[PDB]
Design a protein around this ligand. Structure first.
Ligand code: CLA
Ligand code: CLA
Ligand code: CLA
Ligand code: CLA
Ligand code: CLA
Ligand code: CLA
Ligand code: CLA
Ligand code: LHG
Ligand code: BCR
Ligand code: BCR
Ligand code: PQN
Ligand code: SF4
Lengths: 69, 340, 139, 739, 39
């Protein structure tokens, strides 16, 4: 139950962004497990060694997100 | 300011003094704060020079800058160029210190209590309101400053004649100079050897002549408004009058730097050190004939070189502001390099 | 203390007659020899430093100590608040790679109010972040 | 045949404020701090930015002009420091006694003690580069000629910078101008090497010969005629040599035998000044000029005559070699990395040849007397040569990964050599292990025989002696050469093979170097380490395409850390990591080579001389029976000769002590990057990001640890820097203490 | 020169100008007042 562009804190407890805020880019349709597309500004450890950047967008669930707006 | 369009202009903090150049009260406040800073430097540094003075040595070798400026007027000078009693230097230093205190108090008064523009006043404050476009009020301010400089020249004249005695390099005593020169033809002829005059009566005669000339210019500028022949040739803005004043003070600094290094009676050789030699290396500086041990220089060298370099950079400040007053963009010179 | 002062130490008085000139001033070793006379030396002739906190030797330690504690705090505050004012302009990455040098010069000049600003930021809560909104690592 | 495009790239300063524009993944944005290291790791990778063979080639050409500006401003700094802040005219007044110094230090923090008394009242730091003897060989007299040479060098530095801007942004050449490789080869042969050798032959005839002749006669400074006065008055040149009255006319009628009084074949050394004869080197440079310009017309460009190299490579094919060199002309004119590997290999071996020739035939006046100049010039050129050979092993692998197209070269020498990579490497490491046991286990064996108190079972000369008979026979042939196999030569090629002891100013220039069994063992040590470095680099070249462990190595790139922890583990498998290992092995090889040089030359060659003919050396002949032990290499060389670095405080050689300890520091600092891996430091840096996020000071540039290749690169860089700085400080402080 | 002001304000040139200014004032303070172990 989130909009498209609201700040939300993550409570994944196993991700790189754990406690960092993110903007919900889109919420997909129901039925799937992790529909909440969340984008961040800080990239994670991703890619091969010596890569210039990583990824920021990620599919998250609903019950592990704390809305801060 | 110039304001080549964009009437509501915003300056950043590194040009932060350009923000109050249109307003009136802060324009008074910053300048009287600056005059408070000059009076503070004068009084506090002649006190600091009394604090670091040794009578067992000569004067100009130890960096004595303000005490020779007071001893040329002959306040606490004894015999043979020796200073044994320094009361009036401390007196004039305390006078300048309390004068700086009251000038800074007036500066903070005009910053805080007096408003920005003097057009919102009702009584005498509305008469002091000025704008950079009407030249009449600027002429009134111009004439009153002319009158005050003439009054200062008359006070120096009274110090030379009645209020005390000056100092000479011939007898090396005080001298109550009376009966100066009265002829203006020889003053017209003094445009060639003004550096070495070698007579104090001619000095006080030139001072009373330039003082009466200043009073004449003052009453002339108060009496008549500025005419229309100069308004077609002189620009009327803040930076224009800033440019004219900057060129004037740069020329005055060059003249004072020439006067310091070569004179002998307005700068005595026992107070400022020996007269200098104009030596051009990369830039024309002023070198001494003898060399001081601890890489040191006399007061004449410091005064002449500092006033020369400050006059040079004030000439380039006049150049910057005068090209700014003529409509030049100054990112046009960056756009000329970028088009290339 | 068991250390003799340099005003009467025999090894220091034997070693001060030939102190080497460091700078181009030819009397630099002699003025160093009379500058280090106030300090105390051991049995070798070298000036030791009492660091216990007693103020009679505070010129050995405490007087430069707080001097550095100004300048480091100055650098720290200039490095901190500048990051805050590039937390958003349009993109902080290029403003960290190339420097917004008028903003940097503004912070570099204004950094001499750093300890009062530090107590102000500590009281306003904008110095120390909360223990829950910080991106911690998983246990 | 000139093909130039006009204005390909606009000159603009706006691209300078956007770092990382040359690569596609760097110009997006610095999201992570590793982008910064990538900005320096791909700044010269011009093959990864452009992929059209025309933009990269003009980028290389302008980069050559920029580097040439760097060398010209460096050479200008050498001549300017020799002009203004040196004692070149003072050293020229008295070359034997006082010592050269071309750097004065500002006394600020007590470093005025570095300005030691080098002789004649002048203070400063004594130079060991020895370009003063270069200047006396060229013919410099006063400091004004060095000053005008520095001014002309700075003029040509700005001229090369303007040529770089002109050849990239105004008039840049096309790809066919670069691929004219036969015109490039014969122009570089004749017009660059041969024409430059003819220019220096003319300078050695007119300037270097008469000035050094009257300086060997004993003419004081401010009494030598100016170098142009010999041309302006040929009588002053004709009174020194009788053949100059004959004029140019015997040269054209092939009457060269009357030129024999000033183009001699003396050889050996000059007994007055302790260097090569200037008439010998003048005749030498003239002969090299003639042979190079003759060889500078071999390749056809426009006039039909000449060898195009394509059918040269077509014609060489044998039974073992299949199709021969069919395809290599298309390889070496379409890939810059193969040309870089060949040129770095041959420039590295050239620089090592330069070091191995500039110690037994000292070409400069008073160079062999100054031991610090001789030792520093030897070891520095040894290190530059070994570095460039490792770069050959690098760019061979880069050619294999990104510039090797297997469809064009089928059954040629490159394909056949890649087809039996196991039969090459499995014999190369066998001879590595055989040399390793038979050059190091000999050292362990007589170390143990000396430690067990039985010296009759060692490998000494009094013990079981391994006499190097082949080089001793070669020395016998070089001693017997002048008069039998070189009849117009008076002296030998050098006095290191065999002959008299050359003494100049109380010191020894060059005496014959006998080769005992210690030289046998240390030469096999040298051949062993050369074989191992030529194993790591060669198996980085051959195994860069694919393998049996990982057969997908070409698609992963040249510079990748690993394939993963699988197959037991595949870390350090790329062609880059073989260069990373070969750099340490070049360090070990050249350290032992310059150690053998320094100890043998200061135990059997150098030292003072006595008027009755007896020679006393610096270490009194330790290399005979004490260079065969590891404890002998430690006690008598690394402990005894390091005392001049240790006990030199409060003196002129005081900076070398705090460079000795500095080099030990950078070695020990390199071990942190070499031993540890990235993921520890990533797990620690993220905790420091937590401690920054607690105070809201965490940077928006994401701070994270170095890459794995970056960690190995900074480890090998600090290792080689620390070891070379330690050896530099030790060699300079020792050989400046011994004179 | 709209790009020269950005190139002179990159991180290496600004940190080199700041370290040159810091080393300059440190060397000048150590020339006019040398050998200060304490206060
Ligand atoms: C002799 C030194 C001197 C003096 C007398 C002044 C005086 C003044 N400055 Mg000022 N200033 C100075 C140096 C000085 N400045 C320097 C060196 C800088 C650069 C750091 C500035 C940067 C600056 C800014 C950015 C601003 C002032 C402003 C002002 C005015 C205060 C108005 C107010 O109360 O708000 C006052 C006339 C303010 C002003 O005029 O705004 C109306 C203002 O905004 N100043
Ligand atoms: C009569 C004196 C006078 C006055 C009233 C002004 C007034 C003004 N000038 Mg200015 N100027 C002057 C002299 C003067 N100038 C001289 C002599 C020069 C030549 C060096 C300049 C060069 C100059 C430039 C290049 C610019 C101005 C600008 C300006 C305007 C913005 C306010 C400002 O200066 O920024 C506030 C002042 C500061 C922040 C000070 C800067 C800090 C300096 C670098 C440190 C001081 C240097 C040094 C330590 C001084 C001590 C010397 C020695 C004892 C060691 C303002 C109207 C600016 C303008 O028109 O833009 C709107 C502008 O770009 N001026
Ligand atoms: C100016 C920004 C800044 C600030 C405020 C801090 C503040 C802090 N750092 Mg730190 N750090 C910085 C930059 C900064 N760091 C940088 C750039 C690096 C990479 C070299 C580090 C590496 C680092 C490590 C490895 C550690 C800290 C730690 C700490 C904390 C303890 C104090 C300390 O040891 O600092 C001392 C600072 C250093 C040793 C390195 C900084 C040295 C540079 C020269 C300071 C200036 C940086 C920058 C150029 C200035 C920007 C000015 C701006 C106008 C552009 C403290 C919160 C420690 C910690 O976790 O505490 C719990 C710790 O272990 N820092
Ligand atoms: C006979 C004429 C001639 C001469 C003297 C040279 C000389 C040189 N060429 Mg060259 N070249 C020539 C013809 C010639 N070339 C032709 C005909 C072609 C096209 C087929 C090329 C294509 C070419 C390329 C592609 C490159 C060179 C380079 C160089 C330089 C090599 C190293 C160096 O900088 O030396 C030190 C400098 C000197 C000895 C100065 C001598 C030259 C003065 C200015 C005359 C050298 C200056 C390389 C380069 O750019 O180096 C900077 C390079 O990459 N040349
Ligand atoms: C590039 C090299 C170079 C240059 C510029 C010169 C230049 C010169 N040589 Mg020359 N020379 C050279 C190489 C060179 N030489 C070599 C390699 C030899 C050895 C074969 C000679 C042998 C030689 C003789 C024997 C004589 C000259 C002479 C001369 C001068 C007369 C002008 C002329 O046409 O000849 C002239 C300055 C003549 C002379 O002394 O005039 C001053 C003369 O008699 N040269
Ligand atoms: C003719 C000489 C020459 C030329 C043109 C090249 C050219 C090239 N090499 Mg290369 N190389 C050479 C010699 C040469 N090399 C030699 C002799 C070696 C053996 C050491 C190597 C080893 C080598 C490796 C291992 C790699 C390259 C790579 C590359 C390519 C990219 C360069 C790059 O990103 O570095 C940009 C420049 C730098 C990173 C600067 C390096 C700074 C060094 C490490 C420190 C210098 C220490 C200094 C002297 C001491 C003082 C510093 C301090 C104490 C004050 C480029 C085509 C890379 C490549 O192709 O990857 C795909 C690559 O990975 N080269
Ligand atoms: C001092 C430490 C050390 C030693 C001894 C070696 C030794 C060796 N390295 Mg090596 N290496 C080292 C450090 C060392 N490395 C480091 C730091 C690096 C980092 C860059 C490398 C990188 C490296 C590479 C990249 C390669 C080697 C290779 C080799 C082998 C070459 C063959 C040889 O010399 O014959 C064998 C010589 C010895 C074993 C030393 C002699 C010792 C005596 C004679 C043997 C003991 C006698 C007897 C067995 C004792 C019996 C007692 C009983 C109780 C067992 C050799 C085993 C190469 C290899 O293995 O292929 C050929 C190879 O390719 N090394
Ligand atoms: C040494 C023998 C010799 O140099 O032969 C070199 C021999 C050359 O083969 P060919 O005679 O076919 O060579 C014709 C070549 O000139 C064409 O590249 O090749 C080998 O046998 C390779 C093995 C070298 C390693 C030999 C062990
Ligand atoms: C910046 C600014 C400004 C300005 C200001 C100013 C610049 C000020 C100045 C001021 C001043 C500058 C003041 C002064 C003061 C003074 C004082 C403070 C004094 C005191 C002294 C004393 C008290 C002394 C005493 C004594 C005596 C009398 C004698 C005996 C001894 C003794 C020495 C003790 C303004 C606001 C506009 C605006 C904003 C910014
Ligand atoms: C006096 C003395 C002493 C003592 C000392 C002590 C004992 C110390 C302690 C210490 C401690 C017990 C400390 C604590 C601390 C804690 C904390 C908690 C801290 C805080 C910090 C922070 C928070 C930071 C911040 C900042 C600043 C301030 C600036 C810059 C920026 C930053 C952010 C970095 C001694 C004996 C040595 C000697 C004598 C003298
Ligand atoms: C310490 C370490 C790190 C951490 C490396 C870091 C944090 C790099 C440190 C760089 C700092 C910022 C120093 C800057 C480097 C130079 C001193 C810059 C020169 C600046 C002057 C000219 C002013 C690794 O990432 C690593 C990776 C793989 C194997 C081993 C290691 C490893 O040992
Ligand atoms: S240890 Fe490192 S380099 Fe080796 S396989 Fe694992 S990840 Fe790759």
């Amino acid at each position: 139950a989130l909009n498209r562009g609201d700040k939300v804190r993550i409570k994944r407890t196993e991700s790189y962004w754990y406690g960092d805020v993110g903007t919900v880019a889109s919420v997909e349709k129901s039925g799937i497990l992790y529909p909440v597309i969340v984008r961040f500004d800080r990239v994670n450890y991703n890619g091969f060694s010596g890569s210039a950047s990583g990824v920021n967008t990620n599919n998250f669930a609903e019950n592990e997100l704390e809305l801060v707006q | 300011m110039q304001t080549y369009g964009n009437d509501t202009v915003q300056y950043e903090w590194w040009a932060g003094n350009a923000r109050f150049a249109d307003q009136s009260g802060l324009f008074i406040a910053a300048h009287v704060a600056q005059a408070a800073l000059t009076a503070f430097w004068a009084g506090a540094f002649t006190l600091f020079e009394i604090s670091r003075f040794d009578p067992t040595q000569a004067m100009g070798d130890q960096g004595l800058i303000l005490l020779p400026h007071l001893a040329t007027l002959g306040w606490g000078v004894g015999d043979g160029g020796q200073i044994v009693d320094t009361y009036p230097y401390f007196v004039i230093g305390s006078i300048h210190l309390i004068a700086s205190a009251v000038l800074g108090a007036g500066a903070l008064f005009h910053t805080l209590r007096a408003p920005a523009d003097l057009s919102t006043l009702k009584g005498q404050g509305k008469k002091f309101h000025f704008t950079w476009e009407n030249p009449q009020q600027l002429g009134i301010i111009l004439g009153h400053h002319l009158l005050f400089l003439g009054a200062g020249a008359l006070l120096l004249a009274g110090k030379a004649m009645y209020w005390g005695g000056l100092y000479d390099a011939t007898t090396q005593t005080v001298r109550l100079v009376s009966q100066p020169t009265l002829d203006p033809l020889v003053i017209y002829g003094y445009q060639t050897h003004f550096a070495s005059i070698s007579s104090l009566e001619d000095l006080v005669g030139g001072h009373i002549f330039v003082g009466f000339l200043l009073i004449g210019g003052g009453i002339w500028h108060i009496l008549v408004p500025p005419l229309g022949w100069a308004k077609k040739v002189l620009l009327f803005s803040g930076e224009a009058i800033l440019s004219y004043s900057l060129g004037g003070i740069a020329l005055a600094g060059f003249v004072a730097a020439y006067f310091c290094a070569v004179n002998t009676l307005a700068y005595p050789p026992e107070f400022y050190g020996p007269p200098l030699a104009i030596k051009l290396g990369i830039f024309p500086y002023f070198a001494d004939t003898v060399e001081l041990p601890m890489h040191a220089h006399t007061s004449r060298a410091w005064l002449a070189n500092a006033h020369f370099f400050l006059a040079f950079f004030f000439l380039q400040g006049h150049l910057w502001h005068a090209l700014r007053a003529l409509g030049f963009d100054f990112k046009r010179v960056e756009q000329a390099f970028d088009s290339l | 203390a068991n250390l003799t002062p340099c005003s009467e130490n025999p090894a220091y008085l034997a070693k001060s007659k030939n102190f080497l000139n460091t700078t181009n001033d030819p009397n630099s070793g002699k003025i160093r020899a009379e500058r280090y006379a106030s300090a105390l030396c051991g049995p070798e002739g070298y000036p030791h430093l009492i660091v216990d906190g007693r103020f009679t030797h505070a010129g050995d330690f405490l007087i430069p100590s707080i001097l550095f504690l100004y300048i480091a705090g100055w650098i720290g505050w200039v490095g901190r608040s500048y990051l805050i004012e590039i937390r958003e302009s349009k993109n902080p990455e290029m403003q960290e790679v190339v420097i917004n040098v008028p903003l940097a010069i503004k912070k570099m000049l204004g950094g001499f109010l750093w300890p009062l600003a530090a107590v102000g930021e500590y009281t306003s809560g904008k110095l120390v972040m909360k223990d829950s909104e910080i991106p911690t690592s998983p246990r | 045949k000139v093909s130039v495009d006009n204005n390909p790239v606009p000159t603009s300063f706006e691209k300078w404020g956007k770092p990382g524009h040359f690569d596609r993944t760097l110009a997006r944005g610095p999201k992570t701090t590793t982008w910064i290291w990538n900005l320096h790791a791909n700044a010269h990778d011009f093959d990864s930015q452009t992929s059209d063979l025309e933009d990269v080639s003009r980028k290389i050409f302008s980069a050559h002009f920029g580097h040439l500006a760097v060398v010209f401003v460096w050479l200008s700094g050498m001549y300017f420091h020799g002009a203004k802040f040196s004692n070149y005219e003072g050293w020229l007044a008295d070359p034997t006694h006082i010592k050269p110094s071309a750097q004065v230090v500002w006394p600020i923090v007590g470093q005025g003690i570095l300005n030691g008394d080098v002789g004649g009242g002048f203070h400063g730091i004594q130079i060991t580069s020895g370009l003063f003897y270069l200047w006396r060989a060229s013919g410099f007299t006063d400091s004004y000629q060095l000053y005008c040479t520095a001014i002309g060098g700075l003029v040509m530095a700005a001229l090369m910078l303007f040529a770089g801007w002109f050849h990239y942004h105004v008039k840049a050449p096309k790809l066919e101008w670069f691929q004219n490789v036969e015109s490039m080869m014969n122009h570089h042969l004749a017009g660059l090497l041969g024409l430059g050798s003819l220019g220096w032959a003319g300078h050695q005839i007119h300037v270097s010969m008469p000035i050094n002749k009257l300086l060997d006669a004993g003419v004081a400074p401010k009494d030598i005629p100016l170098p142009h006065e010999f041309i302006l008055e040929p009588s002053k040149m004709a009174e020194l040599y009788p053949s100059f009255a004959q004029g140019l006319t015997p040269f054209f009628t092939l009457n060269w035998g009357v030129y024999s009084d000033f183009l001699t074949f003396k050889g050996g050394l000059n007994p007055v000044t302790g260097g090569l004869w200037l008439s010998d080197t003048a005749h030498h440079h003239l002969a090299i000029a003639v042979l190079f310009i003759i060889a500078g017309h071999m390749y056809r460009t426009n006039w039909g005559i000449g060898h195009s190299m394509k059918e040269i490579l077509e014609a060489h094919k044998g039974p073992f070699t299949g199709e021969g060199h069919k395809g290599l002309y298309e390889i070496l004119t379409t890939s810059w990395h193969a040309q870089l590997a060949i040129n770095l290999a041959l420039l590295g071996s050239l620089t090592i040849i330069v070091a191995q020739h500039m110690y037994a035939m000292p070409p400069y006046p008073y160079q062999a007397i100054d031991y610090a100049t001789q030792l520093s010039l030897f070891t520095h050129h040894m290190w530059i040569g070994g570095f460039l050979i490792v770069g050959a092993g690098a760019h061979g692998a880069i050619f294999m990964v990104r510039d090797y197209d297997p469809a064009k070269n089928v059954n040629n020498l490159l394909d056949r050599m890649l087809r039996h990579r196991d039969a090459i490497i499995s014999h190369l490491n066998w001879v590595c292990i055989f040399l390793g046991f038979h050059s190091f286990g000999l050292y362990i064996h007589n170390d143990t025989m000396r430690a067990l108190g039985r010296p009759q079972d060692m490998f000494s000369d009094t013990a079981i002696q391994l006499q190097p008979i082949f080089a001793q026979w070669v020395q016998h042939l070089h001693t017997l050469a002048p008069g039998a196999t070189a009849p117009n030569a008076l002296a030998t090629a050098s006095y290191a093979f065999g002959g008299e002891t050359i003494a100049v100013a109380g010191k020894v220039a060059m005496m014959p170097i006998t080769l005992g069994t210690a030289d046998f063992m240390v030469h096999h040590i040298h051949a062993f380490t050369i074989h191992v470095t030529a194993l790591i680099l060669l198996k980085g070249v051959l195994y860069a395409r694919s393998s049996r462990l990982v057969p997908d190595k070409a698609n992963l790139g040249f510079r990748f850390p690993c394939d993963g922890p699988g197959r037991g583990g595949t870390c350090q498998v790329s062609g880059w990591d073989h260069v990373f290992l070969g750099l340490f092995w070049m360090y070990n090889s050249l350290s032992v080579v310059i150690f053998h040089f320094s100890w043998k030359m200061q135990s059997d060659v150098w030292g003072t001389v006595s008027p009755d003919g007896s020679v006393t050396h610096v270490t009194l002949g330790n290399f005979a029976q004490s260079a065969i032990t590891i404890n002998g290499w430690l006690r008598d060389f690394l402990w005894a000769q390091a005392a001049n670095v240790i006990n030199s405080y409060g003196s002129a050689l005081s900076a070398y002590g705090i460079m000795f300890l500095a080099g030990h520091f950078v070695f020990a600092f390199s071990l942190m990057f070499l031993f540890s891996g990235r993921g520890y430091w990533q797990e620690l840096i993220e905790s420091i990001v937590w401690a920054h996020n607690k105070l809201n000071v965490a940077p928006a540039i994401q701070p994270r640890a170095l890459s794995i290749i970056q960690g190995r690169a900074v480890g090998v860089a600090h290792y080689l820097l620390g070891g070379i700085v330690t050896t530099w400080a030790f060699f300079l402080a020792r050989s400046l203490s011994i004179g | 020169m709209d790009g020269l002001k950005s190139f002179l304000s990159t991180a290496p040139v600004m940190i080199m100008a700041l370290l040159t200014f810091t080393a300059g004032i440190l060397i000048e303070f150590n020339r006019f007042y040398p050998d200060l172990l304490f206060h």
